[PDB]
Amino acid sequence: LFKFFK
Amino acid sequence: LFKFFK
Amino acid sequence: LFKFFK
Amino acid sequence: LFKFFK
Amino acid sequence: LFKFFK
Amino acid sequence: LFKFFK
Amino acid sequence: LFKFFK
Amino acid sequence: LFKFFK
Amino acid sequence: LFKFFK
Amino acid sequence: LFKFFK
Amino acid sequence: LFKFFK
Amino acid sequence: LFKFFK
Amino acid sequence: LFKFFK
Amino acid sequence: LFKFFK
Amino acid sequence: LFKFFK
Amino acid sequence: LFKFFK
Amino acid sequence: LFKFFK
Amino acid sequence: LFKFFK
Amino acid sequence: LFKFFK
Amino acid sequence: LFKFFK
Amino acid sequence: LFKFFK
Amino acid sequence: LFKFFK
Amino acid sequence: LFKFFK
Amino acid sequence: LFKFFK
Amino acid sequence: LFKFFK
Amino acid sequence: LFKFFK
Amino acid sequence: LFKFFK
Amino acid sequence: LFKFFK
Amino acid sequence: LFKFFK
Amino acid sequence: LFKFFK
Amino acid sequence: LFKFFK
Amino acid sequence: LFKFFK
Amino acid sequence: LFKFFK
Amino acid sequence: LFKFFK
Amino acid sequence: LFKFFK
Amino acid sequence: LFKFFK
Ligand code: NA
Ligand code: NA
Ligand code: NA
Ligand code: NA
Ligand code: NA
Ligand code: NA
Ligand code: NA
Ligand code: NA
Ligand code: NA
Ligand code: NA
Ligand code: NA
Ligand code: NA
Ligand code: NA
Ligand code: NA
Ligand code: NA
Ligand code: NA
Ligand code: NA
Ligand code: NA
């Protein structure tokens, strides 16, 4: 599971 | 801006 | 899932 | 401006 | 889904 | 001016 | 769907 | 002037 | 659909 | 002057 | 930023 | 098991 | 940062 | 059994 | 840091 | 039996 | 550090 | 039987 | 028939 | 820039 | 028909 | 930059 | 149809 | 940088 | 379709 | 650095 | 698809 | 350093 | 998939 | 020093 | 998989 | 000095 | 597996 | 001096 | 396995 | 002086 923000 | 969850 | 804004 | 969700 | 404005 | 949703 | 004005 | 919706 | 004026 | 709708 | 659990 | 952040 | 248990 | 952190 | 029991 | 820490 | 019993 | 520490 | 460029 | 035909 | 570049 | 056709 | 680069 | 098509 | 590099 | 496609 | 290096 | 793919 | 060296 | 793969 | 030297 | 694998 | 020299 | 393996 | 000289 | 093995 992951969260990614740019 | 980008927010990506998986 | 994602949100993208430009 | 662009807002794109998928 | 998206919204685009110019 | 242009507004485009899809 | 769109609206366009010139 | 022009207004165009579709 | 459109409206055009000159 | 011209007004044209379609 | 990235947060990744597995 | 793990948590990873960047 | 990384935390890993096994 | 172990715990590892970086 | 690492803690390992066996 | 053992415990190990680094 | 290491503690080892047998 | 023994105990060992380092 | 109508052809409109702008 | 645009071309429009009806 | 409509072709719009910007 | 974009191209749009309807 | 829509092609949008940015 | 991105390319978007609909 | 969407291709996004950053 | 990343590449994202949808 | 997503490829992320850091 | 890391590589991540989804 | 994830490959992480430190 | 370490290598980690998931 | 994890390989850790210290 | 040590090597650890999981 | 663990190999520890001191 | 010692060598330890698990 | 353990080998200890002193 | 001694040697010890387990
Ligand atoms: Na999530
Ligand atoms: Na969403
Ligand atoms: Na919409
Ligand atoms: Na409309
Ligand atoms: Na009308
Ligand atoms: Na977890
Ligand atoms: Na544990
Ligand atoms: Na123990
Ligand atoms: Na004992
Ligand atoms: Na033109
Ligand atoms: Na263009
Ligand atoms: Na581009
Ligand atoms: Na890139
Ligand atoms: Na890298
Ligand atoms: Na390394
Ligand atoms: Na070593
Ligand atoms: Na030694
Ligand atoms: Na000796």
| Nearest ligand by distance to the CA of V2 | 11
**Per-residue burial over H1-6, b = 16 or more CB atoms within 10 Å of its CB, e = otherwise:** ebebee
Residue AJ6 near residue AI1 (C-beta atoms within 8 A):
yes
Nearest to B4 by CA among X1, Z6, AC3, E3: Z6
Q: Which residues of T touch U (CB under 8 A)?
A: 1-5
Strand partners, Y5: Z3
CA–centroid distance, K3 to ligand 3, in Å, is 29
Nearest-5° Cα angle at C6, W4 to F5: 60
Y–F touching, 3+ CB–CB pairs within 8 Å = no
CA–centroid distance, AD5 to ligand 16, in Å, is 20
Q: How far apart are CA AG3 and CA AJ2, in angstroms?
A: 22
Give Rg (Cα) of chain Z: 6
Position of tokens 């080998």?
AI3
Resolution (in Å) of the shown entry?
1.9
Distances (CA, A) of P3 to G6, AI1, AI4: 77, 15, 17
The two structure tokens encoding residue K4: 């990744």
Cβ neighbors of X6 (< 8 A, separation 6 or more) are E2, F6, W1, W2
Cβ–Cβ of I3/J5 closer than 8 Å?
Answer: yes
The distance between the two most distant Cα atoms of chain AC, rounded to a whole number of Å, is 17
Other Cβ atoms less than 10 A from the Cβ of AE4: the count is 21
**Chain M contact set for L1 (CB, 8 A):** 4-6
| Nearest ligand by distance to the CA of K3 | 1
Experimental method: X-ray
The two structure tokens encoding residue S4: 């409109």
Other Cβ atoms less than 10 A from the Cβ of AA5: the count is 12
Cβ neighbors of AI5 (< 8 A, separation 6 or more) are AH1, AH2, AJ2, AJ3, AJ4
